[PDB]
Amino acid sequence: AEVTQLSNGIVVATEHNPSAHTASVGVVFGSGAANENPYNNGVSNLWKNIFLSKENSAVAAKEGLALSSNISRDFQSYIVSSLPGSTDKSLDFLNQSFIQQKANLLSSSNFEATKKSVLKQVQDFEDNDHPNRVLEHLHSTAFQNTPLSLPTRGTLESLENLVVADLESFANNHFLNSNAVVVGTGNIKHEDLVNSIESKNLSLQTGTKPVLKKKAAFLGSEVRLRDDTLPKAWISLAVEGEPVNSPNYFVAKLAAQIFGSYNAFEPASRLQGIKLLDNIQEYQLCDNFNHFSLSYKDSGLWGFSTATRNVTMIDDLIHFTLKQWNRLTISVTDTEVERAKSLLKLQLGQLYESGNPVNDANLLGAEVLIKGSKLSLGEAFKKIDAITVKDVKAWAGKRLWDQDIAIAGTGQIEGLLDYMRIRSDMSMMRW
Amino acid sequence: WGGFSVSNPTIQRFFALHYLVPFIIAAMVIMHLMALHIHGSSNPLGITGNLDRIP
Ligand code: HEM
């Protein structure tokens, strides 16, 4: 009714839904693709993909289980999904996979069939998924020589250099209990799981903490992947944003909300009450964009992302947009702010209140790791609404106005201008 | 000369023509800059600029 949180060594967390047809259990390791290193990159995405190799996934397929997995930057998750009654059928199959079995998934016929498929995997991504590719490199340059930089799915380089002796090197350090959280989502009780958990003995590497690295940092920089053979142009730009559990966590998400997200095709999109939109549409400066305030444990990235078949006029594209961003400091309409608060809520909803347990897991697992607990929607909303204009005019005033940016891109970006232009559009001339 | 020698009708036309002409240079500097414009500047490498332009 307010989400449960109790620890007997294994911090056991759950979240009940009485109208759910199914449920899900799993673990979340409080160390992700940003706890790795330059040459072991993709180790966390390698771990995910053995966990779903036909072997272990045929086991749980007779049982009636489905497994879910994802790696982030600050965190890393291993979830299993099934019918709510077969709730022990989950917990046991989890127990087998992470304390019982070890080299049953770590075969020299398994691992050389997973790594020979996480290699094709990260060779369609950087090959044909430019919007994320661009998005990923954006981190690489903004957070260069620092934790967040390492692409979550790992470089094809440090991904052909890795054997099983390396899957473990990360496992036995960062796959602990004092870095994990067990989650219960969907259609199960707190007294169903934490019972079935204290039912099982053993302890893996107790007392052990996972290790640390130099805290992340940010620096104004570019990286440009020109490719004049690609029909469009993809660009992503940002400033040093705000972390998870930062005073302006919501203030910053409200700002993103204002300019928001465009799709020049859906007539619905064309009518949004966004000021910037007035400009961009005249000549069709782009095909779409969208904003964001990506928050991570140590640092953040407020900016936006755009694709465009309009090559001669990208220079305006970036211009109109970064000028709008100036208003946030000097001239944002209050009535804009309300449409923000309003729309944030709708978005922040379909995020948190989707009828899909697997999401409510990672969400829970990550948050109850970093701050300890989760924060309720009513808590969030109570904050969103407190937000004045002055909220947004002092946040932009430090974060946005005349601060270093972080551009990245690919496709026909000859037209995308230089760094002393772009960066300079962070401000406006004053008397 | 306007007469027997470089005399008075001379320095007076030399003043007037001194006024006129600099506007002719400026007129001409404009076509000069127009030519410059349609090809853009060269480089201390005598190769093509079109791969690494800045504004
Ligand atoms: C009123 C006198 C002049 C003005 C205002 C002028 C102006 C300019 C300017 C602004 C440029 C671009 C910057 C540069 O490339 O230096 C340029 C380049 C050039 N000028 Fe002139 N100029 C003058 C005299 C001349 C003369 C006397 C010549 C030849 C007899 C000449 C031939 C050229 C050429 C061929 C270029 C291209 C240089 C390159 O490729 O970098 N200009 N001029």
DSSP string over A9-55: SSEEEEEE-TT-S-EEEEEEES--TTSS-TTTTTHHHHHHHHTTSHH
Does residue A235 contact residue A290 with C-beta atoms inside 8 Å? no
Q: What is the total count of domains within chain A?
A: 2
Tokens of A322: 């970064």
The residue whose CB lies within 8 Å of the most ligand 1 atoms, and thus the one to mutate among B23, B36, B42, is: B36
- SS3 (DSSP) at A82: strand
Residue A339's domain comprises 209-431
A225/A312 same-domain check: yes
Pairing outcome for strands A300-308 and A23-29: unpaired
A87/A232 same-domain check: no
Nearest to A51 by CA among A114, A3, A109: A114
CA B33 – CA A412 distance, rounded (Å): 30
Closest residue in A to B54 (Cα–Cα): A418
A187/A334 same-domain check: no
Final residue of a structural domain among A202, A221, A237: A202
Ligand 1 centroid from CA B19, angstroms: 23
A68/A173 same-domain check: yes
Q: How far is CA A280 from CA A223, A262, A275, A355, in A?
A: 25, 10, 10, 36
CB pairs under 8 A between A and B: 5
Final residue of a structural domain among A134, A168, A202: A202
A81/A63 same-domain check: yes
Contacts of B55 in chain A (CB under 8 A): 417-418, 421
A260/A165 same-domain check: no
Map tokens 């960066």 to a residue: A423
* DSSP assignment letter at A85: T
Nearest to A148 by CA among A252, A240, A261, A54: A240
Does residue A87 contact residue A25 with C-beta atoms inside 8 Å? yes
A221/A108 same-domain check: no
Pairing outcome for strands A300-308 and A180-186: unpaired
Nearest to A364 by CA among A96, A97, A48, A75: A75
Pairing outcome for strands A406-411 and A233-240: antiparallel
Does residue A89 contact residue A82 with C-beta atoms inside 8 Å? yes
A260/A343 same-domain check: yes
CATH number of the domain bearing residue A245:
3.30.830.10
Sheet containing A11-16: give its strands across: A4-7, A11-16, A180-186, A23-29, A76-82, A66-71
Nearest to A125 by CA among A160, A164, A152: A152
Does residue A17 contact residue A72 with C-beta atoms inside 8 Å? no
Final residue of a structural domain among A173, A202, A231: A202
Interchain contact A418–B (C-beta under 8 A): yes
Nearest to A193 by CA among A40, A352, A86: A86
Map tokens 């979550």 to a residue: A152
A102/A219 same-domain check: no
Nearest to A15 by CA among A378, A403, A352: A352
- SS3 (DSSP) at A389: helix
Residue A54, number of CB atoms within 10 A of its CB: 11
- HSE-CB of A300 using CA atoms within 13 angstroms: 23
A213/A197 same-domain check: no
A217/A193 same-domain check: no
Q: Has B39 been labeled as part of a binding site?
A: no
Interchain contact A421–B (C-beta under 8 A): yes
Buried b (16+ CB within 10 A) or exposed e, A327-336: bbbeebeeeb
Tokens of A417: 């201008």
Q: What are phi and psi of A194, to 5 degrees?
A: -65, -15
Q: How far is CA A226 from CA A132, A181, A212, A290, in A?
A: 15, 42, 36, 21
Does residue A253 contact residue A344 with C-beta atoms inside 8 Å? yes
Contacts of A226 in chain B (CB under 8 A): none
CA A61 – CA A195 distance, rounded (Å): 25
Measuring from atom 32 of ligand 1, which residue has the nearest CA?
B32
CA A152 – CA A154 distance, rounded (Å): 5
Q: What are phi and psi of A406, to 5 degrees?
A: -155, 85
Map tokens 């016929």 to a residue: A109
Experimental method: X-ray
Cβ-based burial of A276 (10 A; exposed 0-12, middle 13-18, buried ≥19) = buried
Cβ-based burial of B24 (10 A; exposed 0-12, middle 13-18, buried ≥19) = exposed
Contacts of B50 in chain A (CB under 8 A): none
Q: How far is CA A28 from CA A74, A307, A364, in A?
A: 11, 34, 9
- The residue type of A26 is G
Q: How far is CA B44 from CA A76, B34, B47, B48, in A?
A: 53, 21, 8, 11
Ligand 1 centroid from CA B20, angstroms: 22
Q: A425 CA to chain B: closest CA distance, Å?
A: 15
- HSE-CB of A180 using CA atoms within 13 angstroms: 22
Nearest to A286 by CA among A315, A266, A257, A306: A306
Q: Hey, what long-range contacts does B46-53 have (CB within 8 A, 24 or more apart)?
A: B53/A414
A269/A252 same-domain check: yes
